[model samples]
Structure formats: C-alpha cells, structure tokens
Target chain A: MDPLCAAPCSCDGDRRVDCSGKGLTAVPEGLSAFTQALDISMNNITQLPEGAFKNFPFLEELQLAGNDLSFIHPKALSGLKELKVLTLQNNQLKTVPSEAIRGLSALQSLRLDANHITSVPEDSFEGLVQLRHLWLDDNSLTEVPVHPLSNLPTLQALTLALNKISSIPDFAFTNLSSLVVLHLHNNKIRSLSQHCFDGLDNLETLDLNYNNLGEFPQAIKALPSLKELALDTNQLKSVPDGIFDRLTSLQKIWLHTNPWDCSCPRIDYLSRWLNKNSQKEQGSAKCSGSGKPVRSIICP
Target chain B: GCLKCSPKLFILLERNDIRQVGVCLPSCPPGYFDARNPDMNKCIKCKIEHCEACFSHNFCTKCKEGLYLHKGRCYPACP
Candidate 1:
C-alpha cells in the first residue's frame, strides 16, 4: 500500500480519495493506481503535464474544478481506460484539447463550464463515442460548435449558455440527432436561420432566453419532439399565427419580459395559445408596461 | 394564550399538518412591476401613465411601440 498524504488525502477501500480544497498546487505524488474517484477541486493548479495520470489505470472519476489551469498537455489524460466522469470547470483553459481527451471511451459526463474556451477543433470529441451529457456553458464561444461532438452518437444534453454567440446558421445542429435538451440562454444570439435546427429531430427542450432574438426561431417547428420552449427576455414584439400548429408535442413555454405589442391582432394566436396552455413555472407573457390602449391612436 | 390571525387566509394546525396552497410568484405577473420585495415574491402595479417598462411609480425606461418619449414621459407618437 502506497503512503498517501496523511492529512490532505484520505484513502478509503482503495477507491475514493478526498483531497479537495487541500491548498495543493499540483497532483499529489504517491496516488495508488487502484484509486477510482479523485476530487482535487478548489486548488491553484495551473497546468497539466503530459501523461499526468497515466499510472491511474483503474481511475473512474476525476474532478479538477476551481483551478487556474490554462494548459493541459496533449497526453494529460492519455491512459485512463475506465475514466467515467471528468470535471474541469472554472479554469482558464482557452481551447479544448481534443487530443488530451481522445480515448476514454467509457466517459459519460464531461463538465467544462466557466472556462475561457473560445474555439474547438473539428471532430475534437469523436473518440468519446459514449459521452452522453456535456456542459460547455459560461465560455467565450461565439458560435455553436457541435461539429466536434458529431461522432458522439450517445450525446443527449448540451449546455452552451452565457457565451457570445450572435447567429445560428442553417443546419447548425445537423449532426446531433440524439440531442434532447439544449441551453442557449444568456448569449448575444440575434438570429437563427431557417434550417438551423433541421436535424435535431429528437430535441425536446430548447432554451433561448436572455438573448437578442427579435423574432421567433421558426426553424424549431420541425422538431416534433420539442416540449419546453423558453424565449423570455428578448426583443420579440409579436408571434405569428400557427407557429405551434405542427408542434403537437409542445407543452411548456416561457414568453415573459419581452417587448410585446399586445395588440388584439398581433396577439391573436399567442393569447389564444397561452390561454389554452398557460406557461407554467415562470410567469406568463404580458403586454409591455406602456401607454393606454392603442385604440385611441389611428393606424393606416 | 390567544392568537391573532387577522384577515389573511392561512391554515392553522399543530406541528405536522402542512400543505401547500400554490407555488409562489417568481416574478411580477403582467400589468405589474417588480416591487423588489425582500421576500422575493411581490409585484407592484405599473403606475407610470404610459410606462413601457417601469420600476418606480412615475419613471419609465421605455414606452409603448408607437409612443415616443421625451424626458421620461410617453407622447402619442414617435419624435
């Protein structure tokens, strides 16, 4: 049995190690190869050396959240065949090191939120065929980059909130057919092309709140599985009729906090739909707080 | 000792008799403004004459679509 740190590291049954918030700056020296779960959160670590954890063959879950890591060597996570959950949130990583995370075929959930990542290489996540849930929120990404995860056949949920994405071109999610829930809130997204969500046939929950959407993303009408749609706090003035006609599976919608015209003609369909199926959890949409009824003003 | 329940509607029971009435408001409903209540669940009426988005009773950040604003007041048409 190797001598793990007596105070900071606590070993239990050759599986889990609790070294989180230990004030250490780097990976501890003598970790046992049999250790499966390791938590090193809230440390001042800056970089990862190549093959840093190659010795941990049986390691299953590794957490490195709340670090100052700006660099991860190409082979940092090279040899972990059984790794499952890897968390690297709250770091200074500017790019996704696809080569570093190439193999781990058993990985299920990967958390890379609250990083400075701006871009990802194409097909970066092709090796992780079993990845299901991925969190890439709170980064500087200006575009929705699902191309890297195109080969991840099992990916279901993705979070891309709190970024700088401005527009979603046609067929943006053309490759991710299995994705069910997507979070695109709190971004600078202003527009969505006609075919942006053409291939997300199985998508059920779509969040476009806190963006600059001047109009509804009609491209999502093609999604037959969509149930929850969140479009609050935007710039929409009116919703077109029959927008939700084809979406029989639709259930929840969040349309509050926008500049709604609230005129009878403009709100004919929306008012009817919202009255029929009220927006739950969050409050329902209302006319923007403004002047008295528009009946006094004449229009051409 | 006696208890004063006022005109408010609330159920009175001993230790374990608890049931929910409904989910509390997360934000103000329509035709109201955020009251900034300490309890995080209150909305005040929008009092500005033509307030598009109002916080205080007479102040507004925006006006209705067709109405224009001069200073903080909403006019009939855009300037």
Candidate 2:
C-alpha cells in the first residue's frame, strides 16, 4: 500500500515533489535523489526516523509543516548537505533539536513559527554559519536568545515577536552586525537599556509594537540605516526632543495607538516631524486616552 | 558563464558530469545578484547607499532618486 512502491505520485524528476495531505504516516521510499524541493506537510507524520532524508542528497528546500511531528531524530536531516530552506511550522515540537540544527550547516532560512517549542540549547544555532533569516515567532521563549544569535554573523532578519520575552538585557544585540530587520513586537518587554541595541548599524526596519514600553526607545537613534519603525500600541507618554534628528534614511515612522500627552511641551518635537513627514504608512495610527488625534494636537 | 534568455539572463549550472554543461538556470538565487560579480557565476549585494541597482558593492550601475551617479559613485545633487 506504499505510494512509492506503486506510482510514487507525480514528481518533476529532480526539480520538486509535492506529497502534502496524503495521510502518510511514514516517509515514502524510492524518492529521487536529485530532487531540489520537497513538500510533505499536512500529514500524519508524527516522528522523523533516523536518516529520514538520506535519499535526497541534493535537496535544496524541504517543507514539513502542518504535521503532528513531536520527535525528530538527531540525524533526520544529516543527508541534506545542500539544503537551503527548511520550514517546520505548525507542529507539536516542544524543544529545538540542536543536533539536527547543527547538521544544517548550509541552511539559509529556517522557519519554526507556530510551534510549542519552549526552550533552545545555549549554543544550538552556532553552526548555522550561512543563515540569513530565522523565524522563531509564536514560540514560548521567555528571553532573547542573544548569545547563540550573536554567533550568526550573516543574520539579516530575525523575528521574536509573539513570545513571552519580558525584558532585554544590556548589550543584548550589539554583535549582530549584519542584521537588517528585527521584529520583537507582541512580547512582554517593558523597558530596555540604552546600550541594548548598540551594534545594529545596518538595521532598516524595527517592530516593537504591542509591548508594554512606557518610554520612547532612544536606542533606535544609533541605527543609521533605519527607515521604517513601528511603535504602535505601547504605553508611550510623549516623544523625546531631537531623538530622530539627522536620520536621513528614515522613510516611515509608526507612533500611533499610544496615550500621547499632546500637551504644549510634549507636542513640540513629534508634532513638527509628523506634520512635515506625513509620508509614513498607516494614516490611521491615532493616539488614544485623550480622545484627541496626534495630527490635531499642535500647541505652543 | 551566463547568457541572455530573452528578457532574462540565466546562469549556467554544472551537474555532476563535466561533459554535461548545458544547464542554463534561472536568475541567481537569494543573497546574490545577477551580472554583479565579474565571474558572472556569483552574486553579491551592493554596499553603498542609494545604489538602487549595482553590479556589486564596488560597481554601482544605477542610483536611487535624489542622488546623482557619476563614475559609479552616488552623490547628492549640487546647486
């Protein structure tokens, strides 16, 4: 009753194969060794046996999401030496398999979103030397995985949003020099130190929305390549003066949905910038609590 | 080496065999740019600012708006 023993489904030879939603409990046999992409998601695959992917020697992409995967062998993906993209979202994985992660030395992007993973080993991701994008959002992580993440010298985008991280320790992200975009929204961060973001010079977009920050993030002023910043749905009271001056690369700014004081002294700085640079995205980002919109609060 | 595939330029990929060299792949993969490196088989990103399009970090070909391009260097317009 094995599909590979019969027709093996329709495959594009060495290009790609789609075997999703086939009610498969085990990996099919006789898969082409030169397949470039493979999708086996949305199935009943609960566990990946050892050497599950040993047949595909040249696989570049693999998708195993929407499954019931609870356990994966340490060598489950050791055969995929040339794999670049891997997605394991929407699974029941309770922890990150550090052994499997260390085997993926050529991985460029990894997506583990929407999983029940609660913790990661300290040096689990140090072997991903070529990693550029990593998605760990929607997990149960309680703190920023700064040490292991700093080892990735080529990380460009990292998403830690929707986690339980409460605060950022000092000198947390000072070593990720190649980082360009960072997403830390939807966490429980209350405040950050001035030197928390000391080394992100190439950062372009940063999202810290939907947190419990009561003051403006002055650490963003050091990022010279910043363009769009999102600070919506926070507890900000007023904008600081000269906080955003000389940042010529700024293209968009989102400071809406906060409880702005809107008084004379507080409105002087943000009011002028918001009025002059209305080219920012999302025109509906209004301040609450005072019933007065930020665009209409110009005083002194 | 790469050749112009109609409107696109495709790179040449070698399979396992040395005699089989007829593979013309699609545009370069992510983290690389086509026609950027002198080797034509590698891709690299632009390093300077306002380089809307460039062959590589040291070889800018186009400039973004508000900047002037002269001798592969981008500079602000002067009055």
Candidate 3:
C-alpha cells in the first residue's frame, strides 16, 4: 500500500482519492501525480495554502464541502489549468475565495453555497470564462452580487435563494445573456427595477416565490422565452392588465397563496386570463372575502 | 376539452360525432384569424374586405380581389 493511502485515506489506482470524513485537518501530501478527482469533504480541513494542489496538474474535480474551511491563499489553486468542478459549500467562508479561483478558466460548476459570504467584489469571478452553474444560496448576502456575476456571461444556472436581497437594480442581469435558469426565491426582494431582467432573453425558468413584492413585477414582460414562472407566497394584490399577454411561451405559472384582490376591473384581466389558460396555472388562487377561486369570481 | 398545445397549434374540430377534441393554440391556423377574445383563443373568419389570410380581425397578412397586403392591412395600391 502506498504511504499516502496507508490510513484514513484511500486511493483508486492513482486516478482518484477519497479522504472524505477522515478527520483530515489538512490536505494529505504525496498524492498521485495523475490524480484527476479528489474528495476531502466532511473533514476538519481549515485552509488551503499556496500551491496546495500544484502537484496534481490533471485534477479536474475538487470537493471541499462540509468542512471548516475559512481561508484560501491567492495561489492555492495555481497551475490547476484542467480543473472544472469545485465545491466549497457548507463551509465557514466569510467572503468569496476570488483570489484562489481567478485563473481557473476551465471551471464550469462552482458551488459556494451554505457559507457566510456577505459581499463579492467586482472582479471576484473575472477570469472564469467558462463557468456555467454557480450556487450562492444559503449565504448572508443582502444584495445581488451583480458585479462578479455580470462577468460570467456563460453562466446558465444561478442560485441566489435564501439570502437577504431586498431589491433588484435596473439592468442587474443585462450582461448575463446566456443565463437560462435563475433562482431568486426565498429572499427579501420587495421591488424590481423595470430593466432588471433585461438581458435574459433565453431564460426558461424564473423562481421568485416567497418574496415581499407588493405589486406585479412588470419587468418579466421582457422575458420572451420564459416558460415557467413562480410567484406564489408573495405580497401581490393584483396583476395589471396584459401583464402576461406578451409571454407567449409561458407554460406553467405558480400564483397561489397570494392575497389576490378580486375587485371589479382590478382583477378582471387576471381572472379572464386564468379562465382561458387554466391549464397553465400550477396552483389555485383564491379571493379573500368570497373564498372562491379567482378564475370563477364574477366581477360586476 | 383539448389539452394545451404549442403556440403553433390550432384547434381542429372533428365533425364525425361532434367531438370537441383539438389542440389548444395561441392563434388560429391559416385562413382564419384570432378574435382577441378575452374568454377564449377562438378563431373567427377573416371578414376584412378583400383579405385572403389575416392575423387578427383587422390585421390582414395577404390580400385577394387583386388587392395588396401592406402594413398588416389590405390595400388597393401602395402609396
């Protein structure tokens, strides 16, 4: 047995290494030079020193989740030209490990969820040109990290749920033209600028459920390719006329648990639309006083 | 009732047993036009004068009776 795989760690023919749940306080030395995947999750690893994985130039996947990781040196990920997937979730990171991930151009999926990240600098994700899936949910962020996110034009799925974001600024996602799925649910979002979803031309699914929106988000009218939308459990009282008229591609919509005001003219358009496209509705929206479905309500 | 279909689909009624089986679409098929009805996406005959095919009640896509299609409306001649 190789000395690096003697105890607490295991290697699979110099291709993969599994050090997960082994009480590893630091990365094991003398890893195989041809190792492509390394799992050090559920350990006590504290930090990644400079050039920590420099010896494994062919490393493609690095799993560091479920650890006590708090700091990462700027050059910790240097020489990892072939690295693709990096998982740093469920850690103690107070900020984005931007400096350590600057040069990983081949990175496609990056997970930084379940952390204490409060802010992300503008150039935090500057060099990752191929990044696609980014998970920042379950963080302490109060605002959308638009600066770092705007640089990732190739990003497809972005998760920002379970945060404290209150409002979305205009053109907040204008640069993310390739974004397809966006998760903004479970936040404190109260308002959205007119052009907040401007550049999401190819977006398919938009999750905005469980927010503080007091009115209809007219900004979604621009999402011509949107298919599924979630607006349940919000503060929406009434939706404007023709609000969903332009969404010709919309397939499913969640509008339940809202205080839909079933008043004359105010609820006329939504009621009419719901009646015609009842198949597209995912949940039942009811009125307060009558306790009847919004679609069946007869407004005088 | 017909299940929901794509935007390009149109409800085609079968005249055998008066069955209302058809695909639901956003607009009507060719030769007919959308009535812009608030209750249903029903298609109505293109009643525009000298119109061959129409998009809606007033927006004609093609022309008949030697008329021309211009600006989504039928015209005798272009200005």
Candidate 4:
C-alpha cells in the first residue's frame, strides 16, 4: 500500500476498511475498486480529490463523518451512482459544488451534519429525487440555498439542527410535502411565518426546541395533521389565547424554559384557561420558574 | 473558515445560551421601526405608539389616532 501511495490507487483488496482513530491523511487508492465500504472518519484531512474514491464505483457505503475535509469536489462520488449509504458529518466543508452528489441516485441516507457547508449550488441534488433521510445539522448555514436539494421530492426525514437559519421562506420546503419527521432544534430561527409549512400535510413530529422564537408561530397552527410539537428553551412571554385553536389534532406538546411574565396581563387569560383540561392532549408546556405547567383546556 | 472556526462556534463554546436565543433585532423592513430586538422567538414591538396597538408577534398593524376601540385600542375611521 505504501509503494502505491503515489500511484493514485493503493490498498488491500478488502471491500471494507475500518481506519478509525488512525489519523489517515489520504484514502489510499486501489481499494476504491474492491472496497464496498469505506470508513476514514476521525482524521486530520481536509477536502476530497476528484478520483479520491477512484475505481470505487461499486462502493456501497461511505463513512467520512468527523473529519477535517474542508472541500469536496463535485465529482468525488461521481462513479458511485449505486451508493446506498453515505455519511459526511462533522467535516470542514464550507460549500459543496453545484452538482457534487448528483450521481448518487441510489443514495438512501446522506449525513452532512456539523459541517461548515453554508452555500450549495442551486439544483445541486437534482438526481437524488429518491433521497430518504438527510442530516444537515450543526453548521453555519444562514439560509438554505434556493434550489439545493429541492429535487428530493421523496425526502422522508430531514435533520437541520444547530445552525444559523433565522427566517424561512413561505414555500422553502414545498417540495417535501411527504416529509414525516423534521428535526430543527438548536437553531437561530425566530418564528415560522403563516403558511410557511403549508405543504407538509403528512408531517408527524416537528422539533423546534432551543430556537430563538418567542411567540407561538401562526404557521404551526396550520399543520392540521401535526401530532407532536417540541418548543423548548425559548423566551416565550405568554401563550397566545388563540395559539392552539387550530392545532386540534396535536397530541403532545413540549414547552419548557419559556419566560412567564408574572406581571403581563395576558397571564390572567392563561391562568383562566389552565383550569380547563379539554384543550391539550399531552406533554408539558410548562413555564419554567412559574406557578405551573400551562396545558389546560377551556371550552369558552 | 472551518465549521469549528465559525462565529456560532464561539456561541456553542461559551454556551452563551443567549447566542442561541435567535433574537435578531435587525432594521425594520424599510418602512417600520422595531425599537427592540425581539427575542428570537418574538418580534420586537413597534416603535410608533400613536399608530395604534396591534401584536401578532411581528409586523403589528397600527390604527389611526383619535378613534379608540371598545377594547382600549385605537383605530382609523373607515372613511
């Protein structure tokens, strides 16, 4: 393997390698052809060469999470059109090329968590219309690029936790009306505009804990089919009297670490409603350091 | 810069819970003024008190002065 290091392709004929904790600087060549699985995580390398996965067209699994990869050429995974599982989490990639992974039509799970991928080429993932689960957490993304991953019409779950996304456009997620789970915790998003999530008809669980939102977003009330809603670590002053009027199907609500202004006059309205138990289904919408959790239901 | 070198990383490092609160009080959408940088979860209240009081968390509507509503709020005449 050492002799072929400079030959562009070098490695054992094994289909998989667990070089974890070895501090590998480069993904040795030759193994790309026979290696169906590649685990080069926890290294000090940054960026990926075009032929890095050379001859690895049969590469079915890739785990490059938690590395120092600062850049990834668009064609890095060009030959692996049949790749099933790919992980690129915890890297230093700031922006992915426009068509970086457009060849991975068979990709199932694409994990790019905890990276610096702020910008992506529009129409980047036009090929992965079959993409199932996508993980894009812990980054510096202020706003999701216009058409980046918009082609994933079959996206089932998306985890965009821990980022700098403050505002979401009205139809940003319109392409993913079939999404079942959306994990958006630890973000900088303040509020969800009315009709912002208009297309998520089948969305079951939505987590917005640890965001900077204060009031109950009017948009969330539009999710008539929503079941579980998580809104923790926010600075909520008072729950709007009509906030949950439309979320009738909501089963569980987790609201903690919110500010309950004892002096605000709205608390009186909340207090009156707290005595009635016909409104909420489950979970603690409790105000921290306050009189009690506020999940009561009132008829009038 | 690397993701570990991003500005938000410092926020996560110091665990300054405030950094994650999302309360960005940027300039109003050109014609309005929000005196406060609302908590990330909420919009800052409107600055013009004479415009009437309305709150939907953001972009509260204002009513013209002189005509007050039965609810102690003010509004403009339909004419």
- Measured against the true two-chain complex, the DockQ scores of the candidates, in the order shown, are 0.02, 0.02, 0.01, 0.02
Highest DockQ scorer: 2
Better structure of 2 and 3 per lDDT: 3
Off by over 4 Å in 1: A1-7, A279-282, A289-300, B1-79
A1-300 in candidate 3: lDDT tens per residue? 654454667887757889988888888877777789999988898888998998889999999987889989999999999999898977899999888899999998888877889988778999999987788877889998878888988887788888889999998988888877788888999999888999899788898998999978999998999988999989889988888979999999999999999989888998999999999999799897777899997667
Q: What are the per-residue Cα lDDT tens digits for candidate 4 across B1-79?
A: 1123222222111225654333222122322332211122222444334534332122223345565432113445433
Error of 1 at B42 (Å): 21
TM-score of each: 0.74, 0.75, 0.78, 0.68
Q: Interface RMSD for each candidate model? A: 17.9, 15.4, 19.5, 14.8
Worst 10 residues of 4 chain A by lDDT: A2-11
**RMSD of candidates 1 onward, in order:** 16.5, 13.1, 17.0, 18.1
Could you give me the TM-score of model 4 versus the true structure?
A: 0.68
- Give a tens-digit lDDT track for model 4, residues A173-282: 77776676777777788867777777778776788888888777667865777877887778777776767667667776666577765444566566555445334424
Best-fitting candidate, scored by lDDT: 3
The lDDT, on a scale of 0 to 1, for candidate 4 is: 0.62
Q: How close is candidate 3 to the true structure, as a TM-score?
A: 0.78
Model 3 / residue A183 / CA error / Å: 0.4
Between prediction 2 and prediction 3, which has the larger TM-score?
3
In candidate 1 chain B, what residue range of length 10 has the lowest lDDT sum? B1-10
Give the per-residue lDDT digits (tens) of candidate 1, residues A91-149. 88899878888888998778787788999989688789888777787788999885785
Best-to-worst order by TM-score is 3, 2, 1, 4
* lDDT value, residue A180 of candidate 1: 72
